[PDB]
Amino acid sequence: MENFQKVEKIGEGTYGVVYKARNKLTGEVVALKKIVPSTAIREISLLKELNHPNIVKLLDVIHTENKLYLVFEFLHQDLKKFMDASALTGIPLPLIKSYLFQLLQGLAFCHSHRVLHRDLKPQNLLINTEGAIKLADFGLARAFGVPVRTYTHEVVTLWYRAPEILLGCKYYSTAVDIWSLGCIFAEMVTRRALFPGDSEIDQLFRIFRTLGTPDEVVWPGVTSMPDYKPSFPKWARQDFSKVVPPLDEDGRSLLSQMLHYDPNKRISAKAALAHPFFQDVTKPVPHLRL
Ligand SMILES: Cc1nc(C)c(-c2ccnc(Nc3cccc(O)c3)n2)s1
């Protein structure tokens, strides 16, 4: 732990704070995360074995006196920052499609190992000059528990939270990531958050206003979920034509299958990789400003 020289503060994770750092020994640059439950130790130590082209590699795990540090391979930018940098022009579809395609490859890999991310968002998706994008903080959710805020009690967003988690489902599945990726895909395309909810119920109602209030017809058992209230307003479903303009039909159809209410109806990452939308997918390089 004294072999790392903090250089900057990358961000404020939900579990801990992240820093760009240099290994005083190897002299390598890395992303250092500070955060104890033994069950956790084993939990994360298993994640260190996750090796995929689209998963931010977890190099080492350091537990020292009521403290836990995670060493990750360093990447130069998070998807949020990049999107902001392209607000005026917007990311070209070829690049969007490529990112989406790689992201799903990773998700497919993690899901085939029963591992879930559970808190996907622009900030934990990292990109390099090579045109590759990667998932960061995978599995950690399970390693611990999801709080409300953080140390600065600042803001961790519900914007990408799947409906099942918002309605109280205790045992959600890998389908919650697809939904999150689903919402992120939309944001890239429109350059705006699909569901920018400022509270749980507001987050739920925005989804409703756009996808329509769910029922037993589209979502069997929905009315029996922990937080379902028969008193929920009933809104109609709006057509994606107005949701993701100007996205082509292939992407819109692919998107609607990522945004299905019934988790068992929501498309899997593996199946999504087979969708027509990726018929002409390529790997363009981004214009990154560092
Ligand atoms: C949140 C995050 N959690 C982890 C583990 C992150 C991580 C991992 C590897 N590399 C980076 N780099 C990075 C670089 C510029 C801006 C940024 O938000 C993140 N961040 S970001």
Side-chain angles (χ1 to χ4, degrees):
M1 176 54 204
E2 46 278 317
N3 334 57
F4 292 108
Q5 202 58 292
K6 295 187 182 182
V7 184
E8 283 181 299
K9 179 153 173 290
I10 282 181
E12 299 188 2
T14 311
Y15 290 129
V17 57
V18 194
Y19 282 86
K20 179 187 184 189
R22 163 158 271 177
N23 181 310
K24 296 183 175 185
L25 167 64
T26 70
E28 77 187 310
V29 176
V30 309
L32 196 62
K33 185 182 187 195
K34 174 188 176 183
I35 312 182
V36 307
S38 54
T39 183
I41 289 184
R42 317 185 182 77
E43 179 49 39
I44 50 76
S45 290
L46 301 168
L47 299 171
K48 178 162 65 296
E49 310 293 297
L50 261 57
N51 285 185
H52 184 89
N54 299 98
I55 302 302
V56 170
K57 182 69 185 64
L58 158 62
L59 304 186
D60 303 304
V61 183
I62 307 299
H63 179 200
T64 293
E65 60 191 77
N66 207 55
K67 286 185 178 180
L68 182 53
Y69 296 102
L70 293 182
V71 175
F72 288 107
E73 61 166 297
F74 183 80
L75 267 74
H76 270 81
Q77 201 164 76
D78 73 45
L79 190 55
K80 184 165 183 180
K81 172 66 172 298
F82 180 62
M83 285 190 288
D84 301 314
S86 317
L88 307 182
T89 168
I91 316 301
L93 178 67
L95 184 53
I96 294 191
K97 182 181 295 190
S98 184
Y99 284 176
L100 178 64
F101 183 68
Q102 290 177 65
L103 253 33
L104 288 162
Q105 280 183 66
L107 261 52
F109 170 76
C110 293
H111 291 175
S112 73
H113 284 91
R114 323 102 211 175
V115 175
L116 289 54
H117 185 97
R118 148 93 223 308
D119 181 44
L120 292 172
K121 49 195 167 185
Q123 305 85 298
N124 38 65
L125 301 185
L126 310 145
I127 55 169
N128 63 18
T129 61
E130 312 294 303
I133 187 172
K134 304 176 167 194
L135 304 151
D137 278 311
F138 222 103
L140 282 64
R142 164 177 157 180
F144 283 99
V146 55
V148 188
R149 274 61 264 296
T150 55
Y151 38 112
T152 306
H153 294 56
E154 32 92 358
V155 182
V156 278
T157 50
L158 302 160
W159 296 9
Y160 311 92
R161 201 122 300 176
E164 51 262 48
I165 291 170
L166 296 166
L167 287 176
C169 184
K170 303 178 175 59
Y171 309 112
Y172 42 84
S173 72
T174 50
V176 301
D177 292 333
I178 290 70
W179 173 281
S180 296
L181 187 49
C183 297
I184 292 177
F185 172 33
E187 206 171 324
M188 288 198 275
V189 175
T190 69
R191 301 176 233 173
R192 285 195 78 171
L194 188 56
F195 305 121
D198 61 13
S199 73
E200 294 201 54
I201 207 203
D202 185 55
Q203 179 64 39
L204 195 66
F205 288 2
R206 284 172 182 288
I207 296 173
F208 287 9
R209 301 164 204 177
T210 303
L211 299 174
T213 300
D215 48 52
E216 287 299 316
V217 175
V218 299
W219 195 353
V222 66
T223 64
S224 62
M225 289 184 89
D227 312 326
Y228 174 73
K229 302 304 178 187
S231 61
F232 280 156
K234 302 284 186 293
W235 286 290
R237 177 184 200 78
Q238 308 307 159
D239 32 307
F240 279 20
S241 68
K242 176 178 59 179
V243 176
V244 283
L247 194 55
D248 63 63
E249 190 61 50
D250 286 303
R252 292 200 297 149
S253 92
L254 164 61
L255 178 65
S256 74
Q257 285 197 306
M258 290 180 82
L259 302 181
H260 276 320
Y261 276 117
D262 184 330
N264 290 285
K265 280 281 70 68
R266 199 175 300 143
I267 197 176
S268 71
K270 201 62 176 289
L273 296 177
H275 194 296
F277 188 53
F278 303 115
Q279 168 272 322
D280 72 336
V281 64
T282 65
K283 192 181 183 174
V285 283
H287 185 193
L288 286 193
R289 175 181 186 167
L290 315 173

